[PDB]
RNA sequence: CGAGAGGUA
DNA sequence: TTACCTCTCG
């Protein structure tokens, strides 16, 4: 007879793209840099200069 | 989010937000969500709500409300079940349409588009 | 639970809060599971001419649910 | 927050590990920096901890594999130098260095090459308690301390009360004078001490005594104390307590410990050994400082803080680390799944760990404090079996330490449930059930029963008793059995078979998706790096075979593709995309697909209609015949590329003004590839030059000598000699291609694709092909796909047969093909004969189940030789196909031939073949102009050096051959 | 050429 | 244990 557990959720459609963002999926990653950079452990090209020259000028 | 670009674009709003923006003045289309962590026909419209957010990006406020937070005022808006939506135009002297129930976004697109 | 993410939302389905541990719903839903259990049901209402109200009746007729009194 | 609803992402132990060093790491290292000053009193260096800056990359990291180059941050921290005659003070950041940074998928670029660093794991600090059986009498009992350092503390007692160290080789070494050199009283520890007539009727610091903050936990655990955790000494009280559990146990009130379990074992990671390096690096930084002071007192001049410091010690530290460590390893990337499996591993070998010859038998079994925490599967066969492995899913990394496996709570609270992570110690005091709650007798359902784990063992209990259940589907596997479909029907021995394959599949030109599937092939594209997906929301503006643009809220992002470029296993690599322009993207969605992939899912092998059956003999043993369709239709071609570099008649004919061979061009081996020094193609190597970069360079002592590299293009098929097989452990090379019009055929008149023997499936035990194939036929015929989760019978017995035979019925009464299910053998129909016509006698299982194709063809086995180049010392043919050498007829050879009794074979093969240089050269001409070759009588050249080596070390071999008619001696040279 | 690492059967 | 293959690194 019947199964207990329903065949549909088992199928998938033949042409489908899966939905990344969905319920059962882990939360998007982020690129590490970006990351860093964002908590401040990271500093960037612009802020070494600017923290260079100001010292140099105090030198 | 300087760097590293937020994931959800629909925020939480308060009966107190809520009601100044009512009361204010506005040029583009809201629309209110009511929902409960909860109810499981909710997590299936939370995907849809945050898509028609990246289609009409500053031509209309998609924003959302917790019933267990708020739970008196959904009884003053008339709220009889969980996926409920508000439509309310930018224009004051037209009525505001409410819609109840898991509803397709081709509709959701009609309203705002044609009749708010 | 979280605001936001809805990965963790699932908890409250398998912890449930109490008046909700077994969800009834509209008096749709009731029919078409009277015709899959075996058993013949109809439906009396009225729903618009527009494009989802045809979808709802689309797929009562589908399932076999007598639809002669919308 | 995370792995709590949802399985965790593949590569979060490496990100998590990764930011630790950064921060805490680098601070810590840092601090214990001395301030550096000279003889009685000199110049004083003081490196400001506070302030330390980390900057980004220079070059962007597509770059860095471009000039071979590597990824890396700088070091800019704060320092002040009071020279002692000055007494002023000068600021500035000196740049010390560069740190390595790391791709979020795990991978870190170090000249070029992608890097991947492995977990280990090793024995924690703490005190262990063993019963020694004892050879005499009474068992010896004994106790040690594991440190940091890796020196051990041993402790005993005898059947007389013996309390002796056991550090010393020397028998009896007094614990109590230990403890005496404590300045302790004896009065003291009569005090101290339970069991105190025993004790009574009796009458190193910088490396052992430190513990770590893991070895003092263990240590108050284990002995009861509270020293608090802020102390990280061997005080002495503790070695006092350790000595009255001792005798404790010898009158019987005691545990004695299991050292296989893994609350008494640690794991190392990324961040430890970054940490570690960083140490090493800074001490160098020490020597170096202190030298350049003695240079400024002879030169007298006044330093500069830069001066003083180099960068050349933090680089180098790195970049030897990563080149010549044991667990830095390359990255394997001839398909996605290998490079989400890399990262995973977990080894007990490695520096400062077991070798593998040396290690126990009983550290490679399984124990019970394993499960949900390292997979039982898989493991490397070999003298290594057992010792390399893999973490499970669910897995992550504590506190401390200890891995941890998810638990669900069902003991009764106010929310009545939460998921938790348990330490590998703590759990074993709760009763786990994996069972389920379906059963109902005439009183109710907390009475019922179900199987549990308790203590490390298996009970059954009522669902009363039950503290946690394990509820997620894929908990006590890795990520490779959790490929496999129907699992629970497939022995074990052959899971670890076919994990093992499916890491040497080849990604094909074209891609299909699977009918039957688990479900984790979605996650696994995910998270292996070869799918683009957005970093941002937006529309799809432009859209080029090259580039994609994004435009969200006024900002245009471009997105660079991947066009036919090589990999580290010469394998392809080609993106192509999914979205169709003027399409809304959220963040995380897919944009384009990569190789082995088709719309978001693992795809690396195809789907085929197969018949299970013997054919004339072209199965025996483990072979498949096949048919040519799959030649003609190009359903497995493969590309492969590879690459030939240097460093700076008909032939020359490609060869542009500088000589180098042109782009397009198609080269067979002997042709010149680049301008004597030429560089020509090796054999087997035919295709076309997709690209040539002559690259400048740097780092070398002359402008490094730029290097020419070409790259070549071959196109594969199938053909005999190739292996294939399925994901059950199913493995074959194929023996014949055959036309369509020979091949066995069905009902509807279609011909089976290949054909494979029925007799292997009861030796090997798979049943889950049976049950794949059938579904696949189904899915076919009714459009559907299925991906089905393992252990499916917790639902209902034989639940995977109620699946197969009522998709397999449907499917033959939508599509109205009778033959697709059979009421008599179902699964089973009766095909024919294409040569005859005629009705094969008993009925077939035919099914249309997935085949990948593996790395390992025949192109790449195939080596012949005669003549060629010899070596320089043995002078014996060299090894190698790439270097067009011999075979060796080795030791279990030479006995064979014995054996037979073929002495004149035999020399041959010793003398003319093989090292005797005079006879070798006769052998060609005599066999060109028609002659006889004779035996040869002098030695060969093995057996010349011997002598030479010998008469090195003062010793005189010689021979001689006494005449039997004569009876002279004589001397052979 | 000396080491190291990943495989195969 | 035998044989086989690829790589990197000073
Ligand atoms: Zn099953």
């Given at each position: 007879?019947?199964?207990?557990?329903?065949?549909?959720?088992?199928?998938?459609?033949?042409?489908?793209?899966?939905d990344?963002?969905?319920?059962?999926f882990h939360?998007?990653?982020?690129?590490?840099?970006?990351?860093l950079?964002?908590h401040?452990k990271?500093?960037?090209?612009?802020?070494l200069?600017?923290?260079?020259?100001?010292e140099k000028?105090?030198? | 989010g300087?760097?590293?670009r937020?994931?959800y674009?629909?925020?939480?709003?308060?009966?107190?937000?809520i009601?100044?923006?009512?009361?204010?003045?506005?040029?583009?289309?809201?629309?209110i969500?009511?929902?409960?962590?909860?109810?499981?026909?909710?997590?299936?419209?939370?995907?849809?709500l945050e898509?028609?957010?990246?289609?009409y990006?500053?031509?209309?406020?998609?924003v959302?409300?917790?019933?267990?937070?708020?739970?008196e005022?959904?009884?003053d808006?008339?709220?009889?079940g969980?996926?409920?939506?508000?439509?309310?135009?930018?224009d004051?002297?037209?009525?505001?349409?409410?819609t109840e129930?898991?509803?397709?976004?081709?509709?959701?697109?009609?309203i705002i588009?044609?009749?708010? | 639970?979280?605001?936001?993410?809805?990965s963790?939302?699932?908890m409250?389905?398998?912890?449930?809060?109490?008046?909700?541990?077994?969800?009834?719903?509209?008096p749709?839903?009731?029919?078409?599971?009277?015709?899959?259990?075996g058993?013949r049901?109809?439906?009396?209402?009225?729903?618009?001419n527009?494009?989802?109200?045809?979808?709802?009746?689309?797929?009562?007729?589908?399932?076999?649910?007598?639809?002669?009194?919308? | 927050?995370?792995?709590?609803?949802?399985?965790?992402?593949?590569?979060?132990?490496?990100?998590?590990?990764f930011?630790?060093?950064?921060?805490?790491g680098?601070?810590?290292?840092?601090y214990?920096?001395?301030?550096?000053?000279?003889?009685d009193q000199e110049?004083?260096?003081?490196?400001?901890?506070?302030?330390?800056?980390?900057?980004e990359?220079?070059?962007?990291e597509?770059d860095?594999?471009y000039?071979?180059?590597?990824?890396?941050?700088?070091?800019?921290?704060?320092?002040?130098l009071?020279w002692?005659?000055?007494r002023?003070?000068?600021?500035?950041?000196?740049?010390?260095?560069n740190?390595?940074?790391?791709?979020?998928l795990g991978?870190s670029?170090?000249?070029?090459?992608?890097r991947?660093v492995?977990?280990?794991?090793?024995?924690?600090?703490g005190?262990?308690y063993?019963?020694?059986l004892?050879?005499?009498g009474?068992?010896?009992?004994?106790?040690?301390?594991?440190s940091?350092?890796?020196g051990?503390?041993?402790l005993?007692?005898?059947?007389?009360?013996?309390?002796?160290?056991?550090?010393?080789?020397?028998?009896?070494?007094?614990?109590?004078?230990?403890?005496?050199?404590?300045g302790?009283?004896?009065?003291?520890?009569?005090?101290?001490?339970?069991?105190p007539?025993?004790?009574?009727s009796?009458?190193?610091?910088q490396?052992?005594?430190e513990?770590?903050?893991?070895?003092?936990?263990?240590?108050?655990?284990?002995?009861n104390?509270?020293?608090?955790?802020?102390?990280?000494?061997?005080?002495?009280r503790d070695?006092l307590?350790?000595?009255?559990?001792?005798?404790?146990?010898?009158?019987?009130?005691?545990?004695?410990?299991?050292?296989?379990?893994?609350?008494?074992?640690?794991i190392?990671?990324?961040?430890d050994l970054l940490?570690?390096?960083?140490?090493?690096?800074?001490?160098?930084?020490?020597?170096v400082?202190?030298?350049?002071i003695?240079g400024?007192?002879?030169?007298k001049?006044?330093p500069?803080?830069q001066?003083?410091?180099?960068?050349?010690?933090?680089?180098?530290?790195?970049?030897?680390?990563?080149?010549?460590?044991?667990?830095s390893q390359?990255?394997?990337?001839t398909n996605?799944?290998?490079?989400?499996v890399?990262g995973?591993?977990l080894?007990?070998?490695?520096?400062?760990?077991?070798?593998?010859?040396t290690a126990s038998?009983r550290?490679?079994?399984?124990?019970?404090?394993?499960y949900?925490?390292?997979?039982?599967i898989?493991?490397?066969?070999?003298?290594?079996?057992?010792?390399?492995?893999?973490?499970?899913?669910?897995?992550?990394?504590?506190?401390w330490?200890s891995?941890?496996?998810?638990?669900?709570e069902?003991?009764?609270?106010?929310?009545?449930?939460?998921?938790?992570?348990?330490?590998?110690?703590?759990?074993?005091?709760?009763?786990?059930?994996?069972?389920?709650?379906?059963?109902?007798?005439?009183?109710?359902q907390?009475?019922?029963?179900?199987?549990?784990?308790?203590?490390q063992?298996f009970?059954?209990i009522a669902?009363?008793?039950?503290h946690?259940?394990?509820?997620?589907?894929?908990?006590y596997?890795?990520?490779g059995?959790?490929?496999?479909?129907?699992?629970?029907?497939?022995?074990?021995?052959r899971?670890?078979?076919?994990?093992?394959?499916?890491?040497?599949?080849?990604?094909?030109?074209r891609?299909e998706?699977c009918?039957?599937?688990?479900?984790l092939?979605?996650?696994?594209?995910?998270?292996?790096?070869?799918?683009?997906?957005?970093?941002?929301?937006?529309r799809?503006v432009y859209?080029?075979?090259?580039?994609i643009?994004?435009?969200?809220?006024?900002?245009?992002?471009?997105?660079?593709?991947?066009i036919?470029?090589?990999?580290?296993?010469?394998?392809?690599?080609?993106?192509?995309?999914?979205?169709?322009?003027?399409?809304?993207?959220?963040?995380?969605?897919?944009?384009?697909?990569?190789?082995?992939?088709?719309?978001?899912?693992?795809?690396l092998?195809?789907?085929?209609?197969?018949?299970?059956?013997?054919?004339?003999?072209?199965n025996?043993?483990?072979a498949?015949?096949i048919?040519?369709?799959?030649?003609?239709?190009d359903?497995?071609?493969?590309?492969?590329?590879?690459?030939?570099e240097?460093?700076?008649?008909?032939?020359?004919?490609?060869?542009?003004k500088?000589?180098?061979?042109?782009?397009?061009?198609?080269?067979?081996?002997?042709?010149?590839?680049?301008?004597?020094?030429?560089?020509?193609?090796?054999?087997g190597g035919?295709?076309?030059?997709i690209?040539?970069?002559?690259?400048?360079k740097?780092?070398?002592?002359?402008?490094?000598?730029?290097?020419?590299?070409?790259?070549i293009?071959?196109?594969?098929?199938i053909?005999?000699?190739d292996?294939?097989?399925?994901?059950?452990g199913?493995?074959?090379?194929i023996?014949?291609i055959?036309?369509?019009?020979?091949?066995?055929y069905?009902?509807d008149?279609?011909?089976?694709?290949?054909?494979?023997?029925?007799?292997?499936?009861?030796?090997?035990?798979?049943?889950?092909?049976?049950?794949?194939?059938?579904l696949?036929?189904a899915?076919?015929?009714?459009?559907?796909?299925?991906?089905?989760?393992p252990?499916?019978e917790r639902?209902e017995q034989?639940?995977?047969?109620?699946?197969?035979?009522?998709?397999?019925?449907?499917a033959?009464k939508?599509?109205?093909?009778?033959?697709?299910?059979?009421?008599?053998?179902?699964?089973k129909?009766?095909?024919?004969?294409?040569?005859?016509?005629?009705?094969?006698?008993?009925?077939?299982?035919?099914?249309?189940?997935?085949?990948?194709?593996?790395?390992?063809?025949?192109?790449?086995?195939?080596?012949?030789r005669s003549?060629?180049?010899?070596?320089?010392?043995?002078q014996?043919?060299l090894?190698?196909?790439?270097?067009?050498?011999?075979?060796?007829?080795?030791?279990?050879?030479?006995?064979?031939?014995?054996?037979?009794?073929?002495?004149?074979?035999?020399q041959?093969?010793l003398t003319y073949?093989?090292?005797?240089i005079?006879?070798?050269?006769?052998?060609?001409?005599?066999?060109?102009?028609?002659?006889?070759?004779?035996?040869?009588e002098?030695?060969?050249?093995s057996?010349?050096?011997?002598?030479?080596?010998?008469?090195?070390?003062?010793l005189?071999?010689?021979?001689?051959?006494?005449?039997?008619?004569?009876?002279?001696?004589?001397?052979?040279?």
């Amino acid at each position: 007879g019947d199964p207990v557990y329903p065949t549909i959720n088992y199928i998938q459609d033949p042409d489908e793209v899966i939905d990344y963002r969905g319920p059962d999926f882990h939360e998007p990653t982020p690129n590490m840099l970006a990351y860093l950079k964002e908590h401040g452990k990271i500093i960037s090209r612009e802020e070494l200069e600017k923290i260079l020259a100001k010292e140099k000028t105090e030198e | 989010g300087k760097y590293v670009r937020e994931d959800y674009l629909v925020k939480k709003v308060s009966a107190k937000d809520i009601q100044e923006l009512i009361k204010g003045e506005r040029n583009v289309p809201l629309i209110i969500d009511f929902y409960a962590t909860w109810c499981g026909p909710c997590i299936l419209m939370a995907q849809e709500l945050e898509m028609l957010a990246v289609e009409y990006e500053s031509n209309a406020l998609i924003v959302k409300v917790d019933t267990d937070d708020e739970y008196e005022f959904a009884r003053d808006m008339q709220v009889r079940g969980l996926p409920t939506l508000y439509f309310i135009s930018p224009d004051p002297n037209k009525d505001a349409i409410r819609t109840e129930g898991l509803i397709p976004i081709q509709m959701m697109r009609d309203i705002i588009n044609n009749d708010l | 639970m979280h605001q936001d993410k809805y990965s963790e939302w699932k908890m409250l389905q398998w912890n449930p809060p109490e008046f909700v541990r077994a969800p009834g719903g509209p008096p749709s839903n009731v029919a078409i599971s009277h015709v899959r259990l075996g058993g013949r049901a109809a439906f009396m209402g009225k729903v618009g001419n527009d494009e989802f109200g045809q979808e709802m009746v689309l797929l009562m007729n589908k399932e076999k649910v007598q639809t002669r009194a919308v | 927050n995370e792995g709590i609803s949802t399985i965790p992402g593949f590569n979060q132990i490496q990100f998590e590990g990764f930011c630790r060093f950064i921060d805490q790491g680098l601070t810590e290292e840092l601090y214990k920096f001395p301030k550096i000053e000279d003889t009685d009193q000199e110049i004083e260096f003081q490196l400001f901890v506070e302030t330390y800056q980390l900057v980004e990359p220079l070059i962007k990291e597509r770059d860095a594999v471009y000039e071979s180059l590597t990824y890396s941050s700088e070091l800019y921290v704060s320092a002040g130098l009071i020279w002692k005659n000055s007494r002023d003070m000068q600021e500035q950041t000196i740049f010390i260095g560069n740190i390595p940074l790391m791709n979020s998928l795990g991978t870190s670029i170090v000249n070029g090459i992608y890097r991947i660093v492995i977990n280990q794991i090793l024995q924690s600090p703490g005190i262990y308690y063993r019963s020694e059986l004892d050879h005499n009498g009474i068992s010896v009992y004994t106790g040690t301390i594991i440190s940091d350092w890796g020196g051990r503390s041993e402790l005993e007692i005898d059947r007389k009360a013996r309390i002796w160290a056991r550090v010393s080789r020397k028998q009896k070494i007094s614990i109590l004078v230990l403890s005496s050199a404590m300045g302790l009283n004896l009065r003291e520890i009569l005090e101290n001490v339970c069991y105190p007539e025993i004790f009574l009727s009796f009458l190193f610091f910088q490396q052992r005594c430190e513990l770590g903050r893991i070895g003092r936990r263990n240590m108050n655990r284990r002995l009861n104390l509270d020293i608090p955790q802020n102390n990280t000494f061997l005080l002495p009280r503790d070695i006092l307590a350790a000595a009255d559990h001792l005798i404790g146990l010898k009158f019987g009130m005691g545990a004695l410990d299991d050292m296989n379990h893994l609350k008494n074992k640690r794991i190392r990671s990324v961040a430890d050994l970054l940490q570690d390096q960083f140490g090493l690096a800074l001490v160098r930084l020490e020597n170096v400082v202190r030298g350049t002071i003695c240079g400024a007192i002879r030169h007298k001049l006044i330093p500069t803080p830069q001066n003083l410091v180099t960068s050349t010690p933090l680089t180098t530290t790195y970049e030897s680390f990563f080149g010549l460590h044991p667990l830095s390893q390359v990255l394997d990337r001839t398909n996605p799944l290998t490079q989400i499996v890399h990262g995973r591993k977990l080894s007990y070998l490695g520096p400062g760990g077991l070798t593998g010859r040396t290690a126990s038998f009983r550290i490679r079994d399984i124990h019970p404090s394993h499960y949900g925490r390292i997979c039982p599967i898989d493991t490397s066969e070999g003298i290594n079996v057992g010792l390399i492995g893999s973490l499970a899913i669910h897995a992550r990394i504590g506190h401390w330490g200890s891995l941890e496996s998810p638990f669900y709570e069902i003991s009764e609270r106010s929310t009545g449930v939460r998921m938790l992570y348990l330490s590998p110690g703590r759990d074993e005091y709760y009763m786990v059930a994996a069972g389920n709650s379906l059963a109902l007798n005439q009183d109710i359902q907390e009475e019922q029963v179900v199987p549990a784990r308790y203590r490390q063992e298996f009970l059954t209990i009522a669902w009363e008793q039950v503290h946690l259940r394990s509820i997620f589907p894929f908990q006590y596997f890795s990520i490779g059995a959790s490929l496999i479909p129907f699992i629970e029907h497939n022995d074990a021995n052959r899971a670890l078979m076919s994990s093992n394959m499916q890491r040497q599949a080849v990604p094909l030109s074209r891609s299909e998706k699977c009918i039957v599937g688990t479900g984790l092939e979605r996650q696994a594209a995910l998270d292996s790096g070869a799918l683009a997906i957005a970093e941002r929301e937006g529309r799809v503006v432009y859209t080029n075979t090259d580039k994609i643009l994004l435009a969200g809220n006024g900002d245009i992002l471009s997105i660079p593709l991947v066009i036919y470029q090589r990999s580290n296993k010469n394998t392809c690599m080609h993106q192509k995309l999914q979205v169709p322009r003027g399409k809304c993207i959220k963040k995380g969605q897919i944009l384009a697909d990569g190789a082995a992939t088709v719309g978001g899912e693992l795809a690396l092998g195809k789907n085929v209609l197969v018949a299970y059956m013997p054919w004339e003999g072209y199965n025996s043993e483990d072979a498949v015949l096949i048919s040519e369709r799959l030649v003609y239709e190009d359903i497995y071609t493969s590309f492969h590329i590879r690459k030939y570099e240097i460093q700076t008649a008909h032939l020359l004919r490609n060869l542009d003004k500088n000589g180098i061979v042109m782009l397009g061009s198609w080269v067979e081996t002997g042709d010149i590839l680049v301008g004597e020094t030429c560089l020509k193609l090796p054999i087997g190597g035919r295709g076309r030059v997709i690209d040539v970069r002559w690259i400048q360079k740097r780092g070398g002592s002359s402008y490094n000598p730029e290097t020419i590299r070409v790259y070549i293009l071959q196109k594969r098929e199938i053909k005999v000699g190739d292996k294939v097989a399925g994901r059950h452990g199913n493995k074959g090379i194929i023996s014949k291609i055959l036309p369509r019009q020979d091949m066995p055929y069905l009902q509807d008149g279609r011909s089976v694709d290949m054909v494979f023997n029925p007799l292997g499936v009861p030796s090997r035990m798979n049943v889950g092909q049976i049950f794949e194939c059938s579904l696949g036929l189904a899915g076919s015929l009714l459009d559907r796909h299925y991906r089905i989760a393992p252990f499916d019978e917790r639902y209902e017995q034989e639940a995977s047969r109620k699946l197969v035979f009522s998709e397999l019925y449907e499917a033959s009464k939508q599509t109205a093909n009778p033959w697709v299910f059979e009421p008599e053998y179902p699964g089973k129909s009766r095909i024919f004969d294409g040569r005859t016509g005629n009705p094969f006698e008993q009925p077939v299982i035919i099914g249309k189940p997935y085949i990948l194709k593996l790395i390992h063809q025949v192109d790449d086995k195939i080596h012949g030789r005669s003549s060629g180049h010899y070596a320089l010392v043995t002078q014996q043919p060299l090894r190698g196909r790439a270097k067009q050498g011999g075979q060796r007829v080795g030791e279990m050879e030479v006995w064979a031939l014995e054996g037979f009794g073929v002495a004149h074979i035999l020399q041959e093969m010793l003398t003319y073949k093989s090292d005797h240089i005079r006879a070798r050269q006769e052998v060609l001409g005599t066999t060109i102009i028609g002659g006889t070759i004779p035996n040869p009588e002098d030695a060969p050249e093995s057996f010349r050096l011997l002598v030479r080596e010998l008469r090195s070390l003062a010793l005189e071999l010689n021979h001689f051959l006494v005449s039997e008619k004569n009876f002279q001696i004589n001397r052979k040279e």
